Coordinates of C-alpha atoms and ligand atoms in Angstrom, one line a residue:
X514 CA 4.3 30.5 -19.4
X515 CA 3.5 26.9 -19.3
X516 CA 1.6 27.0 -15.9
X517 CA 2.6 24.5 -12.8
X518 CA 0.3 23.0 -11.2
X519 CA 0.7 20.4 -8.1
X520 CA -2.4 18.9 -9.4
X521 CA -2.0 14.9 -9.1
X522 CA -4.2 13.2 -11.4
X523 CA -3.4 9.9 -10.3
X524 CA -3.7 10.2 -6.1
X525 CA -6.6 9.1 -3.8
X526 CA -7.8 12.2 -3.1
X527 CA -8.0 13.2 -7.0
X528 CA -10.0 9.9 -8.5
X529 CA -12.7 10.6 -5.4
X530 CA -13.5 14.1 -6.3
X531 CA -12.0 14.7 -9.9
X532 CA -14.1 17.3 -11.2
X533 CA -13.1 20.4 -9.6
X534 CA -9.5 19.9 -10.6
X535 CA -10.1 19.1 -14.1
X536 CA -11.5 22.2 -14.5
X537 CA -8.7 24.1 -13.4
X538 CA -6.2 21.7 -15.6
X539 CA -8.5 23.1 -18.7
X540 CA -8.6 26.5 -17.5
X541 CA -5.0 27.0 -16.6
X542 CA -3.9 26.8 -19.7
X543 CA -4.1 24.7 -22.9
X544 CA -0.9 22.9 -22.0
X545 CA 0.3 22.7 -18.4
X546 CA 3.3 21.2 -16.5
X547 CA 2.3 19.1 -13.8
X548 CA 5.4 19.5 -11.0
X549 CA 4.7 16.3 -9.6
X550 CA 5.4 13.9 -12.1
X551 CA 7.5 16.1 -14.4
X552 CA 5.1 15.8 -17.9
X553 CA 2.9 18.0 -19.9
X554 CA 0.1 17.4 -19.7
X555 CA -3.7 19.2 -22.2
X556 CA -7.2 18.7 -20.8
X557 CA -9.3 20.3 -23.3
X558 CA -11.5 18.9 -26.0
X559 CA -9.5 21.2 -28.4
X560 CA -6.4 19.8 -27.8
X561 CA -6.9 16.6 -27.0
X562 CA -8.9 15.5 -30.1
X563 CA -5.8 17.1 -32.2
X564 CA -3.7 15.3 -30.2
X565 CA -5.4 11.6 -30.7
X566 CA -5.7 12.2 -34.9
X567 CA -1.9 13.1 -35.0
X568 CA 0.0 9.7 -34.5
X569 CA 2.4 10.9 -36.6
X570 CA 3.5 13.5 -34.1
X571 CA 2.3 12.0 -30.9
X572 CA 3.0 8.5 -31.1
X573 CA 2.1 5.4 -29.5
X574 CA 4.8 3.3 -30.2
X575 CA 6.4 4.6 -26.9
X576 CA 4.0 3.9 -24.3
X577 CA 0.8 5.4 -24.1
X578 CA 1.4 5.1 -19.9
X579 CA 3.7 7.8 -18.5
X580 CA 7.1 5.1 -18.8
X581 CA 9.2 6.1 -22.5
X582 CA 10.0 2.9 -23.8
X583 CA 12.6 4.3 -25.8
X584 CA 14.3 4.4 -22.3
X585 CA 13.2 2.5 -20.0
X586 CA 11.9 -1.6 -19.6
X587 CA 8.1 -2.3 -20.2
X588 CA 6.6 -4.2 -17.6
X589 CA 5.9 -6.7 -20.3
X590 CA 6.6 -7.0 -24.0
X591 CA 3.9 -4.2 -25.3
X592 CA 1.0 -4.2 -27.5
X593 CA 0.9 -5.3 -30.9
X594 CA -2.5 -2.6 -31.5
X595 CA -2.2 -0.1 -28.3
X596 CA 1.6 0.4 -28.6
X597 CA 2.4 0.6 -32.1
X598 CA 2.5 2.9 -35.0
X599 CA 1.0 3.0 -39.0
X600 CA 2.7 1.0 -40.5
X601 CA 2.7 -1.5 -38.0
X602 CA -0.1 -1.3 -36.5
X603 CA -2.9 -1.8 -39.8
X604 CA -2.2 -5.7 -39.9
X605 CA -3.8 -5.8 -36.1
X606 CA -5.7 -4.1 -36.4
X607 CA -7.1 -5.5 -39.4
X608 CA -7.7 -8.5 -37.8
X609 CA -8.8 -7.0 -34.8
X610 CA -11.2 -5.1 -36.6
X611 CA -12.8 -7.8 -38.6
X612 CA -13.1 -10.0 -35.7
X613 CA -15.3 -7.8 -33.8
X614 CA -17.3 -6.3 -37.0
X615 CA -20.9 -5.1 -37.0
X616 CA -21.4 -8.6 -39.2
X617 CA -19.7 -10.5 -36.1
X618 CA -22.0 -8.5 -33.8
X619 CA -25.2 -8.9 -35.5
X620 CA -24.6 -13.0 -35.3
X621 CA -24.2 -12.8 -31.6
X622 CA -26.7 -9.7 -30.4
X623 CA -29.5 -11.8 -29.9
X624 CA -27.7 -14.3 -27.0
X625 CA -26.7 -11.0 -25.5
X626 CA -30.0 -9.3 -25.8
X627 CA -31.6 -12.3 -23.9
X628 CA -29.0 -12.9 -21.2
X629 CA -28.9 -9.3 -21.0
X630 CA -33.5 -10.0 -20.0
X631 CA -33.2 -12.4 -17.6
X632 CA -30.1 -10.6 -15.6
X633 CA -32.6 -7.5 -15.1
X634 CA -35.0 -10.0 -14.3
X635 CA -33.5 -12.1 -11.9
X636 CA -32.3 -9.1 -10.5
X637 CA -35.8 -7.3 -9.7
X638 CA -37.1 -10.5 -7.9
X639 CA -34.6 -9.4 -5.1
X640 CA -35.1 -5.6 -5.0
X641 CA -32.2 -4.5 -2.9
X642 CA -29.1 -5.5 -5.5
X643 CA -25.3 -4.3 -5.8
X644 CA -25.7 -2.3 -9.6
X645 CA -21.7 -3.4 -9.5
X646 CA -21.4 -7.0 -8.6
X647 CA -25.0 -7.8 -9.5
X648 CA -25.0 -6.2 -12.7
X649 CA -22.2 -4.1 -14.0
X650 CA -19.8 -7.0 -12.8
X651 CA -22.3 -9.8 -13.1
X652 CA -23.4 -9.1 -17.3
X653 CA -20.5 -8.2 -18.8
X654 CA -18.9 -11.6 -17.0
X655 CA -21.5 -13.9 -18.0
X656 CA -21.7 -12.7 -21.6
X657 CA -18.2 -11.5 -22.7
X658 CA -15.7 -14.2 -21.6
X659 CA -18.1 -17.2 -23.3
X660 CA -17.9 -14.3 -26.3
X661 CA -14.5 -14.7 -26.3
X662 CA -15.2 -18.5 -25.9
X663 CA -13.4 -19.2 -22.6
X664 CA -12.9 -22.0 -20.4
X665 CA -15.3 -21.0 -17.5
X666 CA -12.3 -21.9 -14.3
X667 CA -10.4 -18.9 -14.0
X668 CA -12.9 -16.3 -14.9
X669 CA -11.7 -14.9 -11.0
X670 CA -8.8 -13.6 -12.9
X671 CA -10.4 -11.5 -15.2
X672 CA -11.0 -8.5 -13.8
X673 CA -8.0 -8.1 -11.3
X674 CA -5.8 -8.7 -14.6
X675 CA -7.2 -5.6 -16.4
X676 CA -7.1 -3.5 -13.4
X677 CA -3.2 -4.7 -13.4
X678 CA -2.5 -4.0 -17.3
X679 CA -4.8 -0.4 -16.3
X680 CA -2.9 0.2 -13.3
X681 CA 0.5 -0.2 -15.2
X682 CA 0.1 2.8 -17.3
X683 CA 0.2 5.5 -14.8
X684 CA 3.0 6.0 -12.9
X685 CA 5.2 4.3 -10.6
X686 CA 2.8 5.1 -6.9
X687 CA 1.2 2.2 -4.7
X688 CA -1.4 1.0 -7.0
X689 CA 1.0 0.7 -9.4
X690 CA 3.9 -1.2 -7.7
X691 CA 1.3 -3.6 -5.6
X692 CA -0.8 -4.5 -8.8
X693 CA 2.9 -5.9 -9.9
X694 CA 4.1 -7.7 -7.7
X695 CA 0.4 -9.6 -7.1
X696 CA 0.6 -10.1 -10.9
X697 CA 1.9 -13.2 -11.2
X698 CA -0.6 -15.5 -11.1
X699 CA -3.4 -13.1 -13.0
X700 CA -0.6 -13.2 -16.0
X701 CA -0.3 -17.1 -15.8
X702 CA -3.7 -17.6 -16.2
X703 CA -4.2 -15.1 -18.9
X704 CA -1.3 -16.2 -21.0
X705 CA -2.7 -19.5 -20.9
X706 CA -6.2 -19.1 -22.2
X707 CA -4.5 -16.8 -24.9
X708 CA -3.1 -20.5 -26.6
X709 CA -5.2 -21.5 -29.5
X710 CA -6.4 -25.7 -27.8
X711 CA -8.2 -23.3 -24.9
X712 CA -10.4 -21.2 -27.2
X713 CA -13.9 -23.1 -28.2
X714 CA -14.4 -22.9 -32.0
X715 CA -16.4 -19.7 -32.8
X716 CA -15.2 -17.6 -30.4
X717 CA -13.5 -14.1 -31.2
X718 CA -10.6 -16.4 -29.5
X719 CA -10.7 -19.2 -32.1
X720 CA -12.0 -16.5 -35.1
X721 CA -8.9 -14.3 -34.1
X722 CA -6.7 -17.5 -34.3
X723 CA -8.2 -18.6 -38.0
X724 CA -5.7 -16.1 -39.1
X725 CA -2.4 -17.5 -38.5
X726 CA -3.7 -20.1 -40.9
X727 CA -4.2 -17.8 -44.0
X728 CA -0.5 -16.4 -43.1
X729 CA -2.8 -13.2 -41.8
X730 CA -1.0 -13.3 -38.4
X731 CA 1.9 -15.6 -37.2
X732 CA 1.5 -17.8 -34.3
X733 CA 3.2 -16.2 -31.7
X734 CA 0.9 -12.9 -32.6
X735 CA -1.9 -15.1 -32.4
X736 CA -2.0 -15.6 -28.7
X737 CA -0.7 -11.6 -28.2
X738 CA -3.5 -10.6 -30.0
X739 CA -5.9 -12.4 -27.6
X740 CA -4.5 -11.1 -24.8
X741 CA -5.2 -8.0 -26.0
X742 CA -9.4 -8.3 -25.4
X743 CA -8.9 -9.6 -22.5
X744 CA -6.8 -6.8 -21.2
X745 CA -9.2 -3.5 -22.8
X746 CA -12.4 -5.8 -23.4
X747 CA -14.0 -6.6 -20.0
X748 CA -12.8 -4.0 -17.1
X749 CA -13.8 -1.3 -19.3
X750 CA -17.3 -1.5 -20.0
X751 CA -17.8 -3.4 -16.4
X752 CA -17.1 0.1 -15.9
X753 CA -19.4 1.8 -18.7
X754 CA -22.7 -0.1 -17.6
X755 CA -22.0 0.5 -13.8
X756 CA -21.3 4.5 -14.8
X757 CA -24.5 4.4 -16.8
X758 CA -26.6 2.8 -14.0
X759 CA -25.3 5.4 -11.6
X760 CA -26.3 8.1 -13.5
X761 CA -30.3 6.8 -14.5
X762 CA -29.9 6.5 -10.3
X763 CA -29.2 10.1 -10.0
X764 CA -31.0 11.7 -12.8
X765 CA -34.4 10.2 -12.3
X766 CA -36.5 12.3 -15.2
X767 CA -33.9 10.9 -18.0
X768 CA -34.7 7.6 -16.7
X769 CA -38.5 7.9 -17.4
X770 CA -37.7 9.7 -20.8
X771 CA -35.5 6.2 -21.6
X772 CA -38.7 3.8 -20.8
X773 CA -40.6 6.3 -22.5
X774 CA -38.4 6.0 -25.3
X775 CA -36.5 2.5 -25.3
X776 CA -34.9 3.1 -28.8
X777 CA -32.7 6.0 -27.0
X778 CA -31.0 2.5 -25.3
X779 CA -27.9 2.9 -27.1
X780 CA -27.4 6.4 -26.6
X781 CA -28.2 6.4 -23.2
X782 CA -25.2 3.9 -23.5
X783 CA -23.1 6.4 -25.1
X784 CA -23.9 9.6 -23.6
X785 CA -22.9 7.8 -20.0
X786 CA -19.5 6.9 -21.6
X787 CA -19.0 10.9 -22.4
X788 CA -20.6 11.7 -18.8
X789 CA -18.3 9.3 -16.9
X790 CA -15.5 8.2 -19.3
X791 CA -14.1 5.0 -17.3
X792 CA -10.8 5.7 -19.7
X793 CA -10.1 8.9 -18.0
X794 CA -6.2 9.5 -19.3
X795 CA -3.5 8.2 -21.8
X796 CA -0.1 9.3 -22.7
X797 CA 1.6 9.9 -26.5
X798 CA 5.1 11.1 -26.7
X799 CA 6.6 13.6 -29.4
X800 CA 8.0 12.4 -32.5
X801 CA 9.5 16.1 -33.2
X802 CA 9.0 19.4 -32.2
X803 CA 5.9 20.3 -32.3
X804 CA 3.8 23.6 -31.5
X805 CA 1.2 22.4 -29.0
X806 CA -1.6 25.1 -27.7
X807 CA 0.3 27.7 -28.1
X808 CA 3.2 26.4 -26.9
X809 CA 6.6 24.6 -28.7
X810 CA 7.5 21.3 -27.0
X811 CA 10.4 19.3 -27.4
X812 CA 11.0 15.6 -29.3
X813 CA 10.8 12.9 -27.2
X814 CA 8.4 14.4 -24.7
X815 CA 5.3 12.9 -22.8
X816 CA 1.9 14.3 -23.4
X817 CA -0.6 13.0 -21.1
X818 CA -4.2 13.6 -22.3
X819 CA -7.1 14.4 -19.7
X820 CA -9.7 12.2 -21.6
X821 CA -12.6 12.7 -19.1
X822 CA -11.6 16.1 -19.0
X823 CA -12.3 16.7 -23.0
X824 CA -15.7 15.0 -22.9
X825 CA -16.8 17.4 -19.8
X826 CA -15.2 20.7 -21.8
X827 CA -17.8 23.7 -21.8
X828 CA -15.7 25.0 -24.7
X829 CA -17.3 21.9 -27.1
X830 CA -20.5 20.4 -24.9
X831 CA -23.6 22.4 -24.5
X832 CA -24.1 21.7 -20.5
X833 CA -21.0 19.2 -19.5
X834 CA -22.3 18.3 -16.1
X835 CA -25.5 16.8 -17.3
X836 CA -26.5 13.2 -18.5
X837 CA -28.7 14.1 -21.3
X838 CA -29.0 10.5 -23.6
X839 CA -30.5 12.7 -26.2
X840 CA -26.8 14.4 -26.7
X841 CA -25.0 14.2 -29.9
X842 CA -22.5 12.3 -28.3
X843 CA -20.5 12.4 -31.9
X844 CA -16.8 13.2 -31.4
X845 CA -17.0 12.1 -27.7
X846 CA -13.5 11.0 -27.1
X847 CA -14.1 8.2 -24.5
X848 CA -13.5 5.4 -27.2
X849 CA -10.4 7.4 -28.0
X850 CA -10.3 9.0 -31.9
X851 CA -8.8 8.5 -34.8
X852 CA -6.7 5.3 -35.8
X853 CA -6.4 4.1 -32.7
X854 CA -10.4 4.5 -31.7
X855 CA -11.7 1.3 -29.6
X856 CA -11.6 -1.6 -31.6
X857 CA -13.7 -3.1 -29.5
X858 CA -16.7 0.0 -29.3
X859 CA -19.1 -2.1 -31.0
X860 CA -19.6 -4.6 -28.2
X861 CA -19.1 -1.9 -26.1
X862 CA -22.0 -0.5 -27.2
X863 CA -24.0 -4.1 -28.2
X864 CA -23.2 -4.4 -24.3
X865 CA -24.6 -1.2 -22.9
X866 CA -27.2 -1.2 -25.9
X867 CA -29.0 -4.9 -24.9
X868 CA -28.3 -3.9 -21.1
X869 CA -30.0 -0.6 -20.9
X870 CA -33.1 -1.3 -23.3
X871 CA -34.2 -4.3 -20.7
X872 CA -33.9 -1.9 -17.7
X873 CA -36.4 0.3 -19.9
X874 CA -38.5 -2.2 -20.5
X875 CA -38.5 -3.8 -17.5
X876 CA -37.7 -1.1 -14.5
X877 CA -39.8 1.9 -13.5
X878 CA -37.4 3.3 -10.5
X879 CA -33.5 2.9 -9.4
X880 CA -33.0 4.3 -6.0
X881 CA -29.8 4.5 -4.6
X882 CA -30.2 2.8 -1.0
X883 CA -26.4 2.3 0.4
X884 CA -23.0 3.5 1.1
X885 CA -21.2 4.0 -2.4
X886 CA -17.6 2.9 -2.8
X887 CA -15.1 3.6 -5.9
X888 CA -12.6 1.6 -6.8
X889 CA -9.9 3.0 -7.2
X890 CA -6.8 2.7 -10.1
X891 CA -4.5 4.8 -12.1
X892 CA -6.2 4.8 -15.9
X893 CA -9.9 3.5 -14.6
X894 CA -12.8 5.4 -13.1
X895 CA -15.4 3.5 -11.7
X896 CA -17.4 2.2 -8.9
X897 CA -17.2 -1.1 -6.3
X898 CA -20.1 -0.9 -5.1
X899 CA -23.6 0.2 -5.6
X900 CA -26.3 -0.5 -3.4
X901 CA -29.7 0.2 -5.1
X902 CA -33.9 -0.7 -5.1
X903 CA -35.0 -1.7 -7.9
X904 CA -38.5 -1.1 -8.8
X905 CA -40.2 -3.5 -11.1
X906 CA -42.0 -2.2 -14.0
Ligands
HEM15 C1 -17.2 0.8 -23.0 C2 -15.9 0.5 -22.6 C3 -14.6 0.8 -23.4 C4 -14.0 2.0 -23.4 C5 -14.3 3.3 -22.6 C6 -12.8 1.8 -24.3 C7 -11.9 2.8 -24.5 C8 -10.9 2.8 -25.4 C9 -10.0 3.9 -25.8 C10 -10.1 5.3 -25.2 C11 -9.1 3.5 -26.7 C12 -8.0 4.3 -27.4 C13 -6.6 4.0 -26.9 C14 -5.6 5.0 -27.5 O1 -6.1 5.9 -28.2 O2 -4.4 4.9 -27.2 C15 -9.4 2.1 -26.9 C16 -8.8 1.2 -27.8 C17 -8.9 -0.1 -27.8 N1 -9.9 -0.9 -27.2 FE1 -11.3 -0.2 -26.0 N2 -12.8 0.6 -24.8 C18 -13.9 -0.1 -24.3 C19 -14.3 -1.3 -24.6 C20 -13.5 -2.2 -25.3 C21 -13.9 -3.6 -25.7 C22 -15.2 -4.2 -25.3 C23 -12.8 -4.1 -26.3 C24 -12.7 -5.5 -26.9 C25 -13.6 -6.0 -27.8 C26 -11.8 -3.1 -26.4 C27 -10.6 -3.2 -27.0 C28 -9.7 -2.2 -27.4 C29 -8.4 -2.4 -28.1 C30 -7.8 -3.7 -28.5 C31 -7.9 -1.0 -28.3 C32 -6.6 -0.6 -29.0 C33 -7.1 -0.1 -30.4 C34 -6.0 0.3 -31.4 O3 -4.8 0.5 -30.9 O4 -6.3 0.3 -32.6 N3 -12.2 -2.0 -25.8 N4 -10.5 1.7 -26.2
FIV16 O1 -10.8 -3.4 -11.3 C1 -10.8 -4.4 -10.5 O2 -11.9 -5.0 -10.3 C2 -9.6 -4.7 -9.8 C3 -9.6 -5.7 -8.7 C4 -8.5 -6.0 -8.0 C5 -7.2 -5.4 -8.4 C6 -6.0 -5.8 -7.7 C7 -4.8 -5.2 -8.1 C8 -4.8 -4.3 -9.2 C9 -5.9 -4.0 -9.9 C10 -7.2 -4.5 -9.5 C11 -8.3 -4.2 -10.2
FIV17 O1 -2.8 -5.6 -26.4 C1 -2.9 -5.5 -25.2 O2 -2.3 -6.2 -24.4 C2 -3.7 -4.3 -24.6 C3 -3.5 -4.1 -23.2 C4 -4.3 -3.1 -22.6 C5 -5.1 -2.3 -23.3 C6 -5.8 -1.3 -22.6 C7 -6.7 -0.5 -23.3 C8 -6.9 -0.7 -24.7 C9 -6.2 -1.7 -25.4 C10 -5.3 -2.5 -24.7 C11 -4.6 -3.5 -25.3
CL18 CL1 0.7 -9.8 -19.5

């Protein structure tokens, strides 16, 4: 009475047409076993959302990939934020959260607002651009890293680091073992921009350091801490902005209703993040035995959570299978919910907001000229490339 399936969420053929199966994870039940990789698994808003504001039952602390730590050895030493539990994990993200505070986004909006003009810009000059590597890639590099106030050698490493860290949370098929053993080299790099000499003074780097000096955070959570936004903070809304372009490229009318209304730039933003969700999944594990749709599961056990799945749900979105920016997007799961819920959201959305309001201003038509590729990897969905015209306003 928990329903198999032989559905696997995390193979080839699934991440390149997802949506049909998704649907039957969220109509085969509330809770369904998933024969291939032996864990529940619930893909409906209803459950989900319950899931995600009960840390108390479904905890973090244990992985939130498909590997129990109580049981087996991490790939590295885990999260301070992502992998821990109240009480733990309020000191990070404390400091995490003041670091990246709608104060410490209003003093750097205006350098990504006009980066975030001249990109669309520059861009529109050429006409036939890659929305990935042109833009989707290209912004969120330029901007985000000097954010974080990095040196600019090594900035290759980025993104193929993320993908790693993303890759290491499903479980243990191709992408997952390659993206280890190439790791080396991505961590080296990481782990050495994380040390507090590498981080220029104002940076959320050098900010996020300030607090080992007020006794805040020690100095070997200093660096972990940093590592930390550069694992969630770039891949991620590379991700966002490219979903969101795809979708002004498909749904032309909502297009003109954004230049007609430029204010609906932010939403836009948002209601992409619901329509895509480039976090598509994420485990917990039971603290005790807990009743779960319907159903009583065991201590100890893996839930994995179909986030894509809840923001597409019929049973709480009017119309799931449209990109409408005028949505209330409000309880959209794609930044996660509750405690843990994206620290990181706000330039997130300062991102897609700044990004989206020049292509208003400045764009009148997207047009997708090309052969579309997706990138593919266990927790991310996203694109490679995106060939598209771009006509100027
Ligand atoms: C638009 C792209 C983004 C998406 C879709 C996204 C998604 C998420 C989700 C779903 C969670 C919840 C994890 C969980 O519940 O276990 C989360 C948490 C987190 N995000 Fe993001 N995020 C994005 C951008 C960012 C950015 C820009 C940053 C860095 C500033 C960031 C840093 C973090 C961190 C550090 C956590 C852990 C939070 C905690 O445990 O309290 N993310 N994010
Ligand atoms: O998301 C990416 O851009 C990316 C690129 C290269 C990658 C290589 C190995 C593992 C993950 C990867 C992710
Ligand atoms: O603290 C980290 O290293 C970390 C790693 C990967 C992460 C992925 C998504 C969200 C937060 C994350 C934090
Ligand atoms: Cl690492």
């Amino acid at each position: 009475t928990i329903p198999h399936l032989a559905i696997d969420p995390f193979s080839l053929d699934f991440f390149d047409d997802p949506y049909p199966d998704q649907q039957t994870l969220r109509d085969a039940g509330p809770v369904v076993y998933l024969d291939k990789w032996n864990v529940y698994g619930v893909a409906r808003y209803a459950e989900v959302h319950a899931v995600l504001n009960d840390p108390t039952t479904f905890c973090s602390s244990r992985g939130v990939g498909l590997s129990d730590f109580k049981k087996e050895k991490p790939w590295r030493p885990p999260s301070l934020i992502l992998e821990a539990d109240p009480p733990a994990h309020t000191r990070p993200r404390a400091v995490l959260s003041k670091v990246l505070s709608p104060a410490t986004m209003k003093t750097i909006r205006d350098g990504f607002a006009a980066a975030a003009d001249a990109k669309v810009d520059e861009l529109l000059q050429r006409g036939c651009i890659d929305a990935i590597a042109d833009l989707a890639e290209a912004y969120p590099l330029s901007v985000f890293p000097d954010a974080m106030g990095l040196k600019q050698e090594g900035r290759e490493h980025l993104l193929p680091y993320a993908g790693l860290v993303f890759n290491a949370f499903g479980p243990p098929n191709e992408l997952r073992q390659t993206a280890i053993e190439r790791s080396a080299p991505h961590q080296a790099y990481v782990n050495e921009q994380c040390q507090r000499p590498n981080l220029a003074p104002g940076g959320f780097g050098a900010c996020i350091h300030a607090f080992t000096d007020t006794g805040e955070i020690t100095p070997d959570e200093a660096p972990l801490l940093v590592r930390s936004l550069l694992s969630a903070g770039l891949d991620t809304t590379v991700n966002g902005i490219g979903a969101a372009v795809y979708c002004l490229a498909r749904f032309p009318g909502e297009l003109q209703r954004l230049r007609s209304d430029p204010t609906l730039a932010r939403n836009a933003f948002e209601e992409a993040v619901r329509f895509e969700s480039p976090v598509q999944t994420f485990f917990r594990t039971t603290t005790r035995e807990v009743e779960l749709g319907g159903a009583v599961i065991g201590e100890g056990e893996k839930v994995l959570m179909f986030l894509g799945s809840a923001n597409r749900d019929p049973r709480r979105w009017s119309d799931p299978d449209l990109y409408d920016i005028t949505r209330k997007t409000s309880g959209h799961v794609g930044f996660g919910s509750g405690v843990h819920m994206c620290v990181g959201q706000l330039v997130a959305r300062l991102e897609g907001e700044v990004m989206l309001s020049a292509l208003a201003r400045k764009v009148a038509a997207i047009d997708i000229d090309g052969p579309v590729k997706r990138r593919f990897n266990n927790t991310l969905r996203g694109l490679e490339s995106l060939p598209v015209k771009l006509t100027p306003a």
